[PDB]
Amino acid sequence: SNDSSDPLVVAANIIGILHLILWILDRLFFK
Amino acid sequence: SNDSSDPLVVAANIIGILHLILWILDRLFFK
Amino acid sequence: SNDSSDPLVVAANIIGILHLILWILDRLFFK
Amino acid sequence: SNDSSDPLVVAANIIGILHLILWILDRLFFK
Numbered sequence: 001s002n003d004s005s006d007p008l009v010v011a012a013n014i015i016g017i018l019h020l021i022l023w024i025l026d027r028l029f030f031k
Numbered sequence: 032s033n034d035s036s037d038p039l040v041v042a043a044n045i046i047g048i049l050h051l052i053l054w055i056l057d058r059l060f061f062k
Numbered sequence: 063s064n065d066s067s068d069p070l071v072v073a074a075n076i077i078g079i080l081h082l083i084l085w086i087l088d089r090l091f092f093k
Numbered sequence: 094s095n096d097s098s099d100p101l102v103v104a105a106n107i108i109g110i111l112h113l114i115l116w117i118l119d120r121l122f123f124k
């Protein structure tokens with residue numbers, strides 16, 4: 001209902017960090 | 032025509048998830 | 063000078079795709 | 094206090110490039 005800020009923008013940011021957590025661990029575990 | 036929200040922002044978010052789907056599968060298939 | 067849209071948002075989107083091009087090729091060349 | 098632009102958007106952009114720096118080096122060091 002709030003057009004001030006769509007959840008897509010916020011979700012995109014959250015996903016970015018989330019991926020880093022998984023990607024970061026993958027690097028540590030495997031090269 | 033609508034300057035309220037550019038497609039670039041929306042597309043960027045979609046791409047993020049899209050990449051995760053491919054990247055996620057790659058990890059499962061190969062380390 | 064234009065506060066309508068910052069270049070950071072546009073650049074971020076461009077970078078996303080750009081990375082995919084390099085990342086995509088890397089997968090094809092190496093698993 | 095400034096609703097003109099949230100730090101999440103700016104941070105997201107910074108993270109994108111930051112990840113590339115680490116990801117780019119990883120590729121150079123290891124395939």
Ligand SMILES: Brc1ccc(C[NH2+][C@]23C[C@H]4C[C@H](C[C@H](C4)C2)C3)s1
Nearest residue numbers: 016039040043047071074078105109
């Ligand atoms: Br327009 C816009 C607003 C916020 C955006 C963040 N998008 C990305 C897309 C992919 C590259 C980087 C980091 C992750 C994944 C999020 C930027 S793009």
